[PDB]
Scaffold this motif. Structure first.
Motif, PDB file in Angstrom:
ATOM      1  N   UNK A 145      89.427  50.681  58.726  1.00 52.90           N
ATOM      2  CA  UNK A 145      88.855  50.619  60.178  1.00 52.90           C
ATOM      3  C   UNK A 145      87.483  49.736  60.078  1.00 52.90           C
ATOM      4  N   UNK A 146      87.509  48.424  60.587  1.00 60.18           N
ATOM      5  CA  UNK A 146      86.281  47.827  60.576  1.00 60.18           C
ATOM      6  C   UNK A 146      86.418  46.922  61.871  1.00 60.18           C
ATOM      7  N   UNK A 147      85.028  46.651  62.153  1.00 65.51           N
ATOM      8  CA  UNK A 147      84.877  45.742  63.362  1.00 65.51           C
ATOM      9  C   UNK A 147      85.204  44.264  63.020  1.00 65.51           C
ATOM     10  N   UNK A 148      85.798  43.599  63.934  1.00 62.39           N
ATOM     11  CA  UNK A 148      86.053  42.084  63.858  1.00 62.39           C
ATOM     12  C   UNK A 148      85.041  41.403  63.290  1.00 62.39           C
ATOM     13  N   UNK A 149      83.699  41.465  63.902  1.00 63.08           N
ATOM     14  CA  UNK A 149      82.614  40.728  63.328  1.00 63.08           C
ATOM     15  C   UNK A 149      82.195  40.917  61.857  1.00 63.08           C
ATOM     16  N   UNK A 150      82.077  42.223  61.577  1.00 66.22           N
ATOM     17  CA  UNK A 150      81.876  42.557  60.243  1.00 66.22           C
ATOM     18  C   UNK A 150      82.988  41.745  59.152  1.00 66.22           C
ATOM     19  N   UNK A 151      84.257  42.318  59.706  1.00 67.69           N
ATOM     20  CA  UNK A 151      85.398  41.842  58.794  1.00 67.69           C
ATOM     21  C   UNK A 151      85.533  39.967  58.619  1.00 67.69           C
ATOM     22  N   UNK A 152      85.009  39.575  59.881  1.00 72.28           N
ATOM     23  CA  UNK A 152      85.027  38.171  59.752  1.00 72.28           C
ATOM     24  C   UNK A 152      83.841  37.681  58.983  1.00 72.28           C
ATOM     25  N   UNK A 153      82.772  38.319  58.920  1.00 76.36           N
ATOM     26  CA  UNK A 153      81.717  37.795  58.153  1.00 76.36           C
ATOM     27  C   UNK A 153      81.955  38.013  56.568  1.00 76.36           C
ATOM     28  N   UNK A 154      82.305  39.455  56.275  1.00 74.23           N
ATOM     29  CA  UNK A 154      82.749  39.625  54.863  1.00 74.23           C
ATOM     30  C   UNK A 154      83.982  38.711  54.451  1.00 74.23           C
ATOM     31  N   UNK A 155      84.964  38.590  55.116  1.00 79.82           N
ATOM     32  CA  UNK A 155      86.169  37.830  54.561  1.00 79.82           C
ATOM     33  C   UNK A 155      85.821  36.518  54.611  1.00 79.82           C
TER      34      UNK A 155
END
Length: 252
Positions: A207-217
């Protein structure tokens, strides 16, 4: 043309999510496949079978044509029906079940959710994954308190007052440029979803937010990011993307 960046970001996030939980030879059930926009993504994943289901026949038609004219090494199956508010039995299990921007529609009624959760559970192989992307109620409600519920790209409208708390609202009006218009959306009761799945053998694993998932990935996928007009998101564009969050369940 104006939502290009927003679209690229959402597609990138979906491509990474698929890549993260799929493997060659996997059988995939796409709930709410729409126009089959993720067909190309699964082709790269190397899946062996793809089954798309959507309540809108007009969307299934577009998906059929897309798969019929694309270079794929996997078989495709399509069926137009409601896999959320109506019992579904495809007579087969899948390694991965995907529901991108549509599972929140299963929270229409208490019974609808129960039917939806049970459909997913019976079509998911032991140890399989259920990947989804839905709006975040916490994020939405937080923006309501801030007084910022829209911009030149989207618009969200909640209910009225009169003894009706903010935790009372269960739906809202969502509008997206070049997309849905005043579309009624149902808030995702996370707790109820997790509890429901838990009793069905599915536990929360991500369960992770789009922004964080977007930045990390993004930092871990320079090629998949460069292979397109992807790049930098503006504040206004980030506001739309930051509305959704990634959620993953696994059958144990």
């Amino acid at each position: 043309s104006k939502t290009i960046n927003i679209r690229n970001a959402n597609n990138f996030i979906k491509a990474c999510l698929i890549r993260l939980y799929t493997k060659r030879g996997d059988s995939v059930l796409d709930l709410g496949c729409g126009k089959g926009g993720d067909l190309l993504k699964y082709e790269r994943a190397g899946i062996g079978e793809y089954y798309g289901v959507d309540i809108a026949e007009v969307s299934i038609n577009d998906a059929r044509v897309r798969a019929r004219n694309m270079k794929r090494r996997f078989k495709v199956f399509f069926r137009a029906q409601d896999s959320y508010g109506r019992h579904m039995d495809l007579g087969k299990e899948f390694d991965v079940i995907s529901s991108q921007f549509s599972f929140h529609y299963a929270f229409s009624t208490s019974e609808s959710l129960d039917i939806a959760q049970r459909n997913i559970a019976r079509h998911l192989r032991p140890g399989g994954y259920f990947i989804m992307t839905v709006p975040s109620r916490d994020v939405i409600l937080e923006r309501y308190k801030q007084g910022r519920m829209s911009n030149d790209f989207y618009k969200i409208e909640l209910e009225k007052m009169e003894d009706v708390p903010m935790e009372s609202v269960r739906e809202y009006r969502f509008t997206l440029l070049d997309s849905v218009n005043n579309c009624i959306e149902y808030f995702v009761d996370f707790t109820r979803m997790v509890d429901g799945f838990k009793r069905l053998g599915l536990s929360l694993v991500e369960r992770k937010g789009f922004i964080d998932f977007y930045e990390d990935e993004g930092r871990r996928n320079p090629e998949l990011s460069k292979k397109m007009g992807l790049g930098c998101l503006t504040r206004e564009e980030s506001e739309v993307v930051g509305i959704y969050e990634v959620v993953v369940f696994r059958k144990l």
